Nucleic acid binder design. Sequence first.
DNA 1: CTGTCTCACTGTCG
DNA 2: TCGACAGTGAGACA
Length: 204
Amino acid sequence: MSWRHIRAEGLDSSYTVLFGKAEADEIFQELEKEVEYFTGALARVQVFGKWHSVPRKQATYGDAGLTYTFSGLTLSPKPWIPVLERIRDHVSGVTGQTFNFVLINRYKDGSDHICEHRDDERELAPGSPIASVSFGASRDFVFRHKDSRGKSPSRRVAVVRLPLAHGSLLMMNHPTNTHWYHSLPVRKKVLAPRVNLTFRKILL
DNA sequence: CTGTCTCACTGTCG
DNA sequence: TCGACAGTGAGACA
Ligand SMILES: O=C(O)CCC(=O)C(=O)O
Ligand SMILES: [Mn+2]
C-alpha cells in the first residue's frame, strides 16, 4: 500500500486506499444492511433560527461504558457490530492507532454534505488523530486554513482538495484540526451513496 | 453578564 | 441546472 503525505502550513494528514475493491465492496454492502441511523430530534438541527434536517444520516458506535455529547444530550454509542470491528481492526493493525468510537455519516448522493468545520476536540484524548474511512461513491473533500475563510480572508493560504475514494483511509493528525477546517461539499452530479466512518479516541 | 464559536439554508450573480 | 459567494441567529459555552 502506498501512502500520500498531505502537508501544508499546520496541516498533517496521510491518505491511502486501505481496502481493495473486493473487500471494500463487501464492507459497503454490510454497512448498508446493518448500520442503524438516527431518526427524530437527533436528525434535526437549528441553523440561524430555522430548523432543517441534518443533510446526511448519522450514527455512533463505540466501546461499552462510553458517553458523548451530540445535539442537546449526553448519549451512549451503540455497541460495536462485527463489520465496524473488522474496519477498526484493519485500521489499527496497519497504523498502530487505536480507537474506541466511530461517527458514521451517510451521504445519500451529492446533495447530502457537511459544511466547513473542525472536529470538536474537547472530549478527545489529547493529541489523538482521527481516522476517516470511506465506502461507496468517491466524494471531494476540502481542507481550508482557518485564517483563509470567508469574504475577506486575513491570509490567502491555498485550499487542499482531494477525492476520498472507495475503501480509502484519511488519517488526520494534530494539529490539522486546530488550523484547518474541512468539508464535503455538495456535488450534484454524484448520484450514488457514500458511507464515511470517522474513528476517534474519546475520553472515558 | 461577556464575549467567541457553530451549524446549513436561501438568494443573487454569472 | 450548477455553482460560487454572501448573508442569515440562537444556543453552548470559558
Ligand atoms: O464525510 C466526511 O468525509 C467528513 C465527515 C466529517 O468531517 C465529520 O463528520 O466530522
Ligand atoms: Mn470532521
